Amino acid sequence: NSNICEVCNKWGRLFCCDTCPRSFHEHCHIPSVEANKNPWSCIFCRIKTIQERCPESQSGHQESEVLMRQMLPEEQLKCEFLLLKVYCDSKSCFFASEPYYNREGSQGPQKPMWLNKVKTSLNEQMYTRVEGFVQDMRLIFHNHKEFYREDKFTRLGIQVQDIFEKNFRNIFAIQETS
Numbered sequence: 437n438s439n440i441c442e443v444c445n446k447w448g449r450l451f452c453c454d455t456c457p458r459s460f461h462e463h464c465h466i467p468s469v470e471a472n473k474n475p476w477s478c479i480f481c482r483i484k485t486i487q488e489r490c491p492e493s494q495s496g497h498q499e500s501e502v503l504m505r506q507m508l509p510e511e512q513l514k515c516e517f518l519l520l521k522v523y524c525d526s527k528s529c530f531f532a533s534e535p536y537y538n539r540e541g542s543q544g545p546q547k548p549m550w551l552n553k554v555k556t557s558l559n560e561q562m563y564t565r566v567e568g569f570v571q572d573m574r575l576i577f578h579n580h581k582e583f584y585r586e587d588k589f590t591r592l593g594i595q596v597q598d599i600f601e602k603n604f605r606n607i608f609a610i611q612e613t614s
């Protein structure tokens with residue numbers, strides 16, 4: 437097994453996957469690493485199994501059909517994995533916890549949003565469709581863009597949104613376009 441957390445790249449109290457060499461902090465894994473379960477398989481391994489059981493699940497899909505999917509167990513898992521892929525980027529730190537807004541010449545967003553909130557919302561089964569999750573995720577980056585205006589700090593929202601969007605297209609097998 438790896439000697440660092442796959443998500444945050446630090447050592448510590450790690451839980452190892454039984455079917456691949458990754459390791460995780462307890463609350464870095466999404467969902468949080470399960471109390472018992474021997475053997476234990478990480479989210480990466482669980483996502484891989486879905487594809488292997490249904491190879492046609494990798495054929496291209498339209499984003500509009502994906503978004504209307506109900507949050508059955510497989511879609512819940514895919515949204516967890518997508519959220520975890522964002523936490524994997526170190527720039528996710530800026531969007532993890534509850535923000536506050538007091539900058540001359542700017543007003544805060546009407547609906548603040550942050551990664552840990554989305555994580556709670558997933559854990560508590562508050563999203564009934566894929567669209568709910570993806571809307572909250574895109575709202576994080578849109579609020580950041582609007583608030584920071586012409587400050588160069590706006591770029592951090594563009595960068596983390598790009599990680600989100602590439603992983604969304606991969607995980608949900610969105611049809612490739614020009």
Ligand SMILES: [Zn+2]
Nearest residue numbers: 441444461464
């Ligand atoms: Zn970690």
Ligand SMILES: [Zn+2]
Nearest residue numbers: 453456478481
């Ligand atoms: Zn694994």
Ligand SMILES: [Zn+2]
Nearest residue numbers: 489490491492
């Ligand atoms: Zn199949």
